[PDB]
Specification:
The chain is mainly β. It is about 10% helix and about 35% strand. The chain has one domain. The protein is built from 4 helices and 13 strands. Strand 9 and strand 10 form a beta hairpin. The protein is globular, with a radius of gyration of 16 Å. Pfam families: Thaumatin (PF00314). This is Thaumatin I. Its main location: cytoplasm. It is found in: Cytoplasmic vesicle.
Amino acid sequence: ATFEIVNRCSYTVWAAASKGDAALDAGGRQLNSGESWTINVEPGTNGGKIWARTDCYFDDSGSGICKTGDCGGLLRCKRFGRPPTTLAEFSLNQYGKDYIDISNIKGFNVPMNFSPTTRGCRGVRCAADIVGQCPAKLKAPGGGCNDACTVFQTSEYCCTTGKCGPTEYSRFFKRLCPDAFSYVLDKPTTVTCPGSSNYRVTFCPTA
């Protein structure tokens, strides 16, 4: 499957793509404002994620640091990034279908549209100004808006026991982005697409 990753933000973003234990394609790349990066994801990939990192500094070997979404200091991510990270999530060719979603469960750093470029399903979007409106306790110094589990590490926010309800914090994310998961037991906003579809992730889709 092919993913075109487009940076429409006015600032440079460092895109990342990983399935948790391995990079997808090159795993990461600098995208200046307007740049597009096309990657190939192997069919059958379960649990892949794409996200943006902000305010990164890397050296030659591709080592450094980002203020949001750092994946252990690497340009080419092998693991997932450090919150806050708006997340595009996908599992491909699962019994003939593809499943996509956008998640705020790990917080929010960059607005994002996640849409197919082929037929038979809708896209999803979280493009509200969550950082600007972020409740005081969730604001991350490096930028972005943390989820409540990252900040407070309680069983309720993290849904450790498998039973948990919405919270004042999760409702904040849900109210600004109804099409994104706001906590782990949220009513699913997953979109079902035909198997072997192709997609575009756009950072800052409106502004």
